[model samples]
Target: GTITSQDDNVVVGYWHNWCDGRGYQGGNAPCVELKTVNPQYNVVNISFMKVYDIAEGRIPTFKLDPTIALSEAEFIAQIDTLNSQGRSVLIALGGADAHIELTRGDEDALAAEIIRLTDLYGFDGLDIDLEQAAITAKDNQFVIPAALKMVKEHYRKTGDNFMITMAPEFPYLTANGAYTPYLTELDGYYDFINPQFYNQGGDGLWIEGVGWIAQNNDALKEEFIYYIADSLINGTRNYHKIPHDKLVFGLPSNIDAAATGYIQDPQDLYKAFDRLKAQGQPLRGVMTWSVNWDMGTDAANNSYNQQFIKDYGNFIHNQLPPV
Candidate 1:
């Protein structure tokens, strides 16, 4: 309907980069090309590249996935095309299930890998999706932050931008959350955070009444949208600090995105965007789990929440100021 500034409110979608069609087992398509998708999301996080090992190591090892090995050259070409389109192609490191965790001991290794990857691929930045062992820092390793600073300094010498982002679960972003240290300490360095706000049930999630499921207290029993938007953008017992502009409400594009936490209806989610706006929260944008699972709404394969992405992109473009 409208347009936003180049650096305005952002809408991001993640690609489970490993998808070779069957569509994320936990997590696609014939592997839609990044440039081939609708230009609704201005920012994109390439779902995952376990490109480096940062935990339990004296130095980090950067590796590439073998599944997409044949398409490696094609992958880089698409990244080049995406960058040419003014999009940020970030390597989402680590995942809900990854082998490595961030540790201070690997600070230098993390930096080297970060720089090497971004430079080699001509990517705009990195997305820290540390889950498992490093969900909460056992210590001050802060591998993501350490690597970000170092990478940005070197990468930017070649360009005008160096973006750093995170995809933390709701519990992890709260002031009381274990991963909050990196967010708080390196608040200024981050571009935005896409806190997964859905799937707060079953064994993996937490609900207000039932209490924590795993080792965190981040779920809401009711008013899932409002409560989450409030806590992350404003403040609450569960969440204490952080700026509003950096908050990007994260959700599943369809119901199959997780063992739980998917938004099946559109209105159920539009309200969240409204709530945040009504509260005057300077929004960053919205994020979906993976484009691979974008359950098309109709027979034509119209992605479930595709329209929402377009609407939000337009709103951000026309309303929000340039970053």
Candidate 2:
């Protein structure tokens, strides 16, 4: 099926807090840089600012610890500056430390905090990236739903138009545990969901072909696309099932050719896009794991980072019709 809707058009930028530090690391700097580079690109999602850390039972203090308070305050300051510049600043919950839990009262507190931050700092929404404490973990799935419920309930009461999003691991793993229920719950609460497609192949890969041997031997790029498309479709089919307009494809700007045993050249990726374009497939958008990995400046200058971004932008502009 051809992707007919213009709303499918999306270009999102992502930043991780662990690598980019809360205050002055890659998270803050690179995000500022990427926004400058691609201002036309809509929406920038940042992750793992550690809301759980502030919640009770996780830590003894009700207020943020000194280290966390300083970093968070600085980060929020930056967020205010960015939001004033017309960028949508979102706080991502749950980065490191799986033991942290958001108690019942904690939910109301967190929701109040989010409301306060949005009002004070001028943020647009919140992103939930509970990868480590995903549903697969025992007694863990409840955390996401509970937090979302609190946030949504607050949104309903206040009538503030803040966006809620989730960053979940990809490939609809049914055997490990039931993900559909959580996804369904998320669909009702969240504005969008970004299903991580890098680690595992999805139903598209399973339905189209089989095994790593087949992926390595032939149709590697096609297989990769298949996985993405399938994941998007499967994710769309889950929960209340968000329409395609709300779904955005999470793409890798940099490929671990050595790990995947696939082509790493930027030109090769361009060729792959060309092929997909010729076939008339839908391209939601592209997102790199981290901009640092692609900056093209290391000991060996073994970086295809800049070229990757340029070529990808060019390919999308040239191949896909304007939204």
Candidate 3:
């Protein structure tokens, strides 16, 4: 149902079905075969179950990119293999360039599609990554949460715990923001919230005394990570008080993985997390934008990739207690 790690700290990594030899979104992050995914990442979020309009309604559908040559059955089999190894493979909904619009009456259709995809691929959960225009679409805020609840309820009836997670950009998660309603609606219904801490340029955190610490400012990087996490756990600045156990801070795997917010050394993040733990706010875990780049997609960061994962496992993963 969820991660089977000895520690409760889950290393979340997005696995893109497309961008095999190309870049991810825009960067040159090559993709990895599902079978060969790194063991360090216990939660594998498959990048996207995009929305499509069928004869029935606007239901989200999952399909591998045409560039990927893996057969449907074979791909499903890899998911099974991963599951047997005690990892969760979740279908992530939406990406940087996908549209997801919903209305009041589409709950059943959305729930049904999620179930269909789960059954077809043995997905352990769903990760909501609706971004920009997708989350802003009509009634989506109301409908998506309801649909996910229905799906989770169905799984509970069958004696399974179907996980549901959110991956909104950091701005939308601020207090009094558009995404707080979903957090409120699905308070205990969802699993965790992994806010993308990259790609937002200078949209930094507003600390009470430290003022605004920009995420892209390399000098204040560790402070940015530590203070933002502290504020999120304590619900400062009107930010929705997300439970520390349900808030997995997201980051880029390498400098080239995102346009901004990339820490050249994982040690910076490790130190920040260590401080959080010492301050009695041990946040859940860390989520990277992708497992691809962590597995060495960007040529420049490829040499340091192994060290990157090692630091996470040592400093972030092991130190945090199980949730």
Candidate 4:
């Protein structure tokens, strides 16, 4: 029989501060338990335990001063635990609150920090969540390119197989706007670019969901997938300025319809895959907005948990062709 890895596409799980001892916001949930629950999930992206914070409106500064949340040693321990089970661990730098000041001659500093963490922690790669910085002017965008340049140079000099990638905001605004220009700058320096298409006011349920599901059954049947595929394709094509192979489709695990956020049901997700395949769009893979939200609890509705994983996994294995 053919090996499962031979055709499997990327499946990354976001583990936000599970190992970090700074009082995780998602309650007492542990990362290892999450790993066990979703053993098949291949890549785990851990965020913001070893970085400094930059100021953003209303968001408090979070600097890892004593840095005991997960020391390099602890991170390595976790990495070994996950890696032994065939899961890749990616270090995500800079979350919503834990921001690193990249503009103030901090590019090299940040890159050096990333190098140290990757080396000490044995991480597979780095994922830059430069949300605040990216939205600034061209001068600010220079920070990412500078940091990436340092990373590339360091990797070349050290002969390390360090992977560099970025998680940028989705493209709902003008295609030729600030985000696109910055992406163009980091063109060759980065690897796969994962675009987050969530959030209430943007392209999430407010627009795409209403457009996809508001019609009658017949209308929904005909337009659901087509509309979704078109929006995703057009959105990515304009915003990312990168090819499809380099883009990963972000899928939400929960839908806050009260807030106009449309969560994808199994049927809806399947239709998305079918539509993409029909259009010959190259979908790298799918990732959830989060793993914590999907756990069987009142927060996520127990049944939806199993259904979400089942549908997501089935889509990857059965719907699309071999990678």
Candidate 5:
């Protein structure tokens, strides 16, 4: 989120706006306010801005969900509170529901709109979660890639602190990926990548992509996390030797939170941190699918991702190296 230097492992949680208790609801109330923003976490992304339109191959048009009770000022005020406390808060664009389409020719205009959103909301950066059409149907192939380039350069010229992050799925980050453009053709411009390791089913699904068997490594416990880590740190393509610190392993915080492929035990996640560090592929950090789901009753008061911070906050927030 924040483009500054990283001296600590990231604990990024997405703030959701629809889960009744922690976020906005049909009744139009956001009752579950953040009781205590985890001091362990350094970043929080406001999730899911609606794609009103992606007209004529330009940057996609966006609108804050009307159902979300918070006004722009409210969200900014919350973000400001986090920023003042030395935490990074960003707006996450795209969702399974909202689709975005872009063309290479739309670079500057897209950058302008993205910058406008950043300026208007006082956001530190954007997390690109472009799924489905945005990735599969990527035309000009250079569209969003060029748009990101323009945004990076524009911020460079303006001396603004804007950062870019991406959240792609397994199929898209396995070294050879549709999103390889971001990792290879344009590398340094991106601060980090948070890949969704959940909802991808079991080892059957994993073996198909990772090329490694899911053996439930003693470190992480989950099979795909190890394989995914293996692919990113050791395999070729998008990860083809990309710096290990540029990746923050992502997982769902709860069961219903993700339809499939999630590690329920915090010990598994804790071990993941341990194993990755031990492997020389010690990643930069961990990111949860949504913090809103981490709260609420059916979900444990101490959620999965929250449990991870409880167990390993010391390592991620204090002991991690800057490299």
Candidate 6:
């Protein structure tokens, strides 16, 4: 019953359990069965365990997409299958629109619910995807980290390494941002962090020679990615230093997956990886917004997800030496 070991170079994909592809313009995207997720993804994050009540001590709930005909037992079975294959299946909490507000005592309740969900579905870990209302909580930094530590400890007592990760927006990672406390507190406890590099308009990176570079700028986008990852790794401007191997670059899988940040060429992303590799940084890997939108069933015809996976496997994963 121990958690499986993760791949050294991970390609993280958020699996949409819900039918409505909230970010996709094509309306409702089909639910991709857990067992059918592409093997390119070493870590598959199930999108959202939503909190219904905005009140204190509110417990979150996760239900399989109603449109999908699969039984609960079948879903659990798929999780087990994925775990057996050395892939980590994680229950991600709070999305862009989730209204999760946690105060002091709510940590224990959140931990209990996460444990319950883990037992129910055989999840290997938790992914903090809290945003907007959830992220702005008065005590998120303290409460959520406490809850995660408790969960990690609970599983460790059972001889399992309960993985923990976060998907924060890019701007929140700066020294003065709201998310710095979480990163500061969770330091050695969480596994890896994939800061979402999309949808934040033009918020970019501050480089040494050039100064500010917008994320949407096609020419310097790779440099922007490099500088951000470098800053996070090297500890620039009082920002807490996360280990190089623990930082993954998160981006939209397709142009439609995000409003602003989408590198049309996978080579551009590889260039970022190459730059990181040149600095002797072990590139942890890349993460996309979703596996569902990556399915190419959206308004766009190209399967950029497939291309990302292919390039990641062939170039990034192959090129980067293990740390």
lDDT of 4 by residue, 146-187 (tens): 766787677667555455666665543336765665567767
Order the candidates by TM-score, highest first.
6, 3, 5, 1, 4, 2
Candidate 6 residue-wise lDDT, 1-323, digit = tens: 45775748888999887675645454334577887788778799998888655663366778787687789889888888888888888889888667676678888988998888888888888888887667768677788999988988898786788888999887787776888877877877888998888888778766678878887877777787878788888888555677888888898876667888888767777777777788788678889877776765555443444655665655645654466
lDDT of each: 0.61, 0.48, 0.79, 0.52, 0.63, 0.78
Q: Each model's TM-score, in the order given? A: 0.77, 0.65, 0.91, 0.71, 0.80, 0.92
- Pick by lDDT: 1 or 3, better one: 3
For model 2 the local lDDT of residue 152 reads: 64
Task: After superposing candidate 4 on the true structure, give the runs of residues whose Cα lies further than 4 Å from its correct spot.
Answer: 1-8, 18-37, 49-75, 132-134, 137-139, 156-161, 202-240, 256-262, 299-307, 317-323
In candidate 4, list every pair of residues with a backbone clash. 54-99
Which sections of candidate 2 miss by over 4 Å?
Answer: 1-8, 18-37, 51-56, 59-86, 103-105, 134-140, 153-160, 172-178, 201-204, 208-219, 234-243, 255-283, 299-305, 314-323
lDDT of 3 by residue, 261-315 (tens): 8786666777888888887778888888778776654543334354446667555
How many collisions per candidate? 7, 4, 1, 1, 2, 0
Model 1 lDDT, full chain set: 0.61
lDDT of candidate 2 at residue 146, scale 0 to 100: 65
Superior candidate under TM-score, 1 versus 4: 1
Give me candidate 4's TM-score against the actual structure.
0.71
lDDT tens digits, residues 189-232, model 2?
66666655454432333442455422333345555544444445
Task: Candidate 3: count the clashes.
Answer: 1
The model with the greatest TM-score is: 6
**Superposition error at 101 for model 2 (Å):** 3.0
Q: Report how far off residue 246 is in candidate 5 (Å).
A: 0.8
Model 3 poorest ten-residue lDDT run: 299-308
- Clash pairs, candidate 2, are 20-26, 20-27, 184-239, 294-305
lDDT value for candidate 4? 0.52
